[PDB]
C-alpha cells in the first residue's frame, strides 16, 4: 500500500535551446500518466515576454515604405515579432534603436540596458542601402502567457503587433526500464525540450508540477 | 422510357387509355396507368406508394357529357330528380391531360394564376 | 459614412477639380 | 413511403462495423466474463483486444 | 513555392507581365523598396548615351476584385544581371515562379 | 400494408373467416395473413369514392408519415404531387458522379 | 522512383507512420498516411455572406421589403416554401408570413 | 500571470447507494481532459483492495469435471465466486471454509464466520442444491493486491481465479462548454462512478486524488 516517489536524476544540455530531463524511479503506469500531464501543461501555460508596440519617426502606417531601406514596414514588423528577450524585475520595458550607414541592422544594435538580456544578437531586422540613410525606433516589451491578437485587445504613428508569449516549441517523452536493487519492475521517464532559450528546464518542470498540484486540491472535497 | 415517358403518360398522349376506360371501366385504367408509371420508376430503384398516382388519376378525369359539364353537378341533379320519383340522366365520362384539366375549373382566379392569363380573363 | 461592419485604415485620399472656381485648405 | 429518413452514414457506419468484427488469435481470446462492464475495463486497461 | 510542380510555373509568371524583367544586362547600382537602377554593360550601349535603366515598382494598389497588388525587389546591391532576368516579384510569385 | 378491406375476405379454409371486413392491416395482421399464405385481398381506393368535393378517410387508408389512420383536414393533393415530383429531380444532378 | 527518394531520405517506403492521441497519449491502432500537400484559399469568405434583418425600408408600388444585402433587404419566401407549409398544415404561420 | 481559475460549482448526484455523478465547473481551456484522463487511469489500474484468488473443491479434480447434485457447472461457480466482495482487517492472506447440505440456494451467508473478516452482501448467490443426498465442501483463498491480474499470466486440483483487487466497477468522464461573462471558451467536467459497495464513490475519488498529489512532492514548491 506504499509507493516509491520519483526524483530529478539528470539534466543534459545539448545546446542553448535543447535539453533533456530524467525522472527516476516510477511504478507501473505512472510514467505515461505523468508524461502526458506534463506535456499538456508545458505546451500552454508557461510565461514569457514579447513585443507589443512600435514607433518609427517618419512612418504613419504599415502600408508604406521608407527611402533607403530595402524592406517594407510590414516586413520589419514581422521580423520584430520574433525577437527573444529576457527581463528581470519588471513587467514592461521600452528599448531604443538607432543606426546609420550601409549594412544590416541586427539585435546587437539596441541600446544596452541593465536588466534586459538579448539571447540571439545576430537576429536581423532590416538593411540600409544608402550611405546617407538612418533609422531610429522605440520598441515596447511586456510579459504574459498565451496568444493575444492585436484586434482582440482593441495617436497616429503607433503600430501594434500580435503577441505570442509562449517560450516552448517542442516537447517529447519516453519511458524506459530502470535498474534498482533486486527489483525489476521500475521505470524512468525522459523528457526532451526544445525552446527559444529564454527559460530554464528545471524551473519549467517545477512550475508545471506546481500548477498540477494546485489544480488537484479541489478533488479532496467534503 | 425516362422523363418524357412519364410526362407523356400524364397528359394522355395518343400513341389507349381512352378506350380502356370507355370499354373496361375506370377500374382498369387506374391499374394500367399505375403499372405503366411504376415500370419507369422501378428501374432506378425509387419507391413510391400507389395512392398518389391514384389521386392524380382521379383529378385527371373530372368532367362528363350527356355540352360538357362537371361530374358532381350531374350527380347532384340526378339525385335531386330521383328524390321526386322522376327520370334522371345518363352520362359518359371523359378524360383530359393535366394541363387541360387545370385550365377547366370552376374558379377563374386559379386558372389565371396558372398560365394563359389573357384568354382566361 | 463608413458602411456598417467595415473597418480599416486610411491610406489614400484623392481630390478632383475642374476648371471652375474656389478651393479648400486641405485641397 | 414507410421507411425512416434519419439514418446514420459514413463515419458512424465505419465505426460500428469496426467494433463488431472479429479476428483469430487476438489478445485475450478465451476468457469468461461477468458482464459488459468487465469487457470495458479490460479494453481500456489494454489487456484485451 | 510548391514542393511538387509540373515545370510550367516560370512561363506563366514571366508571360503574365506582373513582374519586372531586365531589358539590358549590367550591374545593380541602387536598390530600395520602390526603385531599381541598372548600369548597362559597355557592349550594349548606343553612341551618345548615358546608359542607365530605372525601374519603378507598384505599391499597394487595388485590383478589379478589391484585392492587393504589390511588387518586391529580389536582387541585392552590386549584383550582375543578364537580359530577361527577373528583378522584382509580383503578387503570387516567388523568385520568378507562380505560387498560388 | 395500411389499407382497409373493401369486401368479404376470409381464411383459405372453407367457411372460415380470418380478418373481419373493414380492418386496418398493421404488422401483426400482415404477419398473421402471411402465416396462412393468403392469396389476394380486396381494399378500398380513393378513385372509387362517391364523396363530392373531397374524399373520405377510409377510402384513403393509413397516413404513411405517422402510422395511424388519416385525419380530417389534410391536404393530400400537394403531398402526392411533391412525392411524385421529387425523385425525378434528385435523379437529375447525380449523373456526373458515375 | 518515389520509393527510392523516400529511401534516400531515411523514411518508410509505404508512406505511413505511427501517431498518438494528443488528448490521452494513446497510440492509434493502425498506421496513418501523413505528408505534405498544396492548399489554396478561395474568394468565398463568410464575412461577406452573413446577414440578418428585423425591420427596414420598403418598396414604392408593392409595399414589400427590398432585396439585397447592400440595401439591407429581406429573404424571399417563394412558391415552393408555400407548398411545404401547406403540406405541413400550418395555417397560422402561413398567414403571418403573407400579411403581417 | 501565475493566477489560474479555480472551480466554484461542485454538484453531486446519487443515483443509488453505489452509483454517483459529479459535475465540476468551470476550468481553464484544456484542463478537463488533463484531469479526467489521469484520474481515470489511477482509478482503473492502481487502487488497492482484497479479492478471491484460488478455490479448492473436494469432489473436483479438473476444471471441466462434473459434480452431481448441483445445477450449475464449475465454470459458473467460479464466475459467481469472482463477484464476491469482502473486507479483511489486519492481515493479507485468509482461508475460508464452506460446508452445506440440503436442497436450496447456497449463498454467502453460509460461509463459516471468522471475525477480522466481513462480508458486504450476505445474500450473494453462490449455487443451488437440488437433492437431499448432495452436499458441498470447499475452500476459498483471499489475498491483497492492486489493480487487475488475469489468471492466464500465472499459469493438487487447485483452480485459478481472476483477481479483482480494485473496488471500482465503472468510471467515465465527459467534457462540455462553459462561459464566464462573455469568456466563452471554458471547460466543464462530468464524472460517472460505480463501485462494488466496499467503499462509496466519493471516498474513492478522494483517495485517487491523494495518491496522484503525493507523487509530486519533490517538485512542488
PDB file of C-alpha atoms in Angstrom, chain D residues 27 41-48:
ATOM      1  CA  UNK D  27      -5.146 -10.725 -27.474  1.00  0.00           C
ATOM      2  CA  UNK D  41     -12.466  -2.397 -18.125  1.00  0.00           C
ATOM      3  CA  UNK D  42     -10.353  -4.978 -19.957  1.00  0.00           C
ATOM      4  CA  UNK D  43     -10.352  -2.979 -23.191  1.00  0.00           C
ATOM      5  CA  UNK D  44      -9.485   0.336 -21.525  1.00  0.00           C
ATOM      6  CA  UNK D  45      -6.704  -1.190 -19.413  1.00  0.00           C
ATOM      7  CA  UNK D  46      -5.042  -2.596 -22.535  1.00  0.00           C
ATOM      8  CA  UNK D  47      -5.366  -6.257 -21.528  1.00  0.00           C
ATOM      9  CA  UNK D  48      -7.675  -7.430 -24.327  1.00  0.00           C
TER      10      UNK D  48
END
